[PDB]
Write a protein that binds this ligand. Structure first.
Ligand code: O0Y
Length: 284
């Protein structure tokens, strides 16, 4: 029975290494990672890998690892797949902790845009959870934390994190992570997976997939929302992606909306994440 070495980047940036049989389905590796992380609420999380295009793909837990990574290294990242709309309803604090770690990376990476004050408030709750009560002995008029908080760090932002941290005296880690999530969950791009596309007229847009539905970002003025209830069917063909959109109240026919993706693989990637999110929605 031949075994392949797996390397997994965890959300704290640490690296987990293990072996699985070469014919293993993704679930086998994911179970080993989740046991390492003492994670029980596993269904919100998944593993990603990079293809030769350095594009992120979800490892399908139901499919053979070898049939997915194909030519690539057995190198993966542990990520949030389904962002809970209401993280207070997760059963375990450790689930909320890994969700906070994922959101901290979504923020630093710029996937999750954030106002100055929200960057400072989230940062202040992270510092509270990890260091406890503000300590002046660990501070100065110049102080620059180790913590990454934003895609573009400024002294103004560092100062504001310290001001807010002083206010959290006595707050426990689970409490500070809950306040972190109460703020993060309200951000317009929370849990939104963005896909580059063109509309039917060749105009570049972004397609956003999230718990609530599919978002179109044409411009800051033109923004379509298709709540999952309105979506009957999601399909791809060649480089094309289509959604079948419910007749309006008293209308006779469904409508189909068509999009151009960068290639067949990018169309397939978007369709799979849409199907998986639509299922998640009907379980809420
Ligand atoms: C079990 C997999 N399924 C996929 C959408 C899922 C994922 C997260 C929560 C949940 O209640 C269900």
């Amino acid at each position: 029975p031949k075994s392949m070495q797996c390397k997994v980047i965890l959300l704290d940036g640490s690296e987990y290494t293990c072996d699985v049989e070469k014919r293993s389905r993704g679930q086998v590796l994911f179970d080993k990672v989740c046991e390492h992380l003492n994670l029980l609420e596993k269904d919100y999380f998944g593993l990603t890998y990079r293809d030769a295009e350095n594009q992120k793909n979800w490892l399908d837990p139901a499919k053979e690892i070898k049939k997915q990574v194909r030519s690539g290294a057995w190198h993966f990242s542990f990520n949030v797949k389904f962002y809970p709309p209401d993280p207070a309803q997760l059963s375990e604090d450790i689930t909320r902790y890994y969700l906070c770690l994922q959101l901290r990376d979504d923020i630093v990476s710029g996937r999750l845009p954030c106002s100055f004050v929200t960057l400072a408030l989230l940062g202040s709750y992270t510092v509270q959870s990890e260091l406890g009560d503000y300590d002046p002995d660990e501070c100065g008029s110049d102080y620059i934390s180790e913590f990454r908080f934003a895609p573009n760090h400024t002294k103004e932002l560092e100062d504001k994190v310290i001001e807010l941290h002083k206010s959290h005296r006595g707050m426990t880690p689970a409490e500070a992570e809950m306040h972190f999530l109460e703020n993060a969950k309200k951000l317009s791009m929370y849990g939104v997976d963005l896909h580059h596309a063109k509309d039917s007229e060749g105009v570049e847009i972004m397609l956003g997939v999230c718990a609530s539905g599919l978002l179109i970002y044409r411009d800051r003025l033109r923004i379509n929302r298709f709540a999952w209830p309105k979506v009957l069917k999601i399909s791809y063909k060649r480089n094309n992606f289509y959604i079948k959109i419910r007749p309006g109240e008293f209308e006779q026919f469904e409508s189909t909306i068509g999009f151009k993706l960068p290639n067949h693989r990018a169309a397939k990637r978007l369709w799979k994440v849409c199907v998986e999110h639509h299922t998640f929605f009907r379980l809420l």
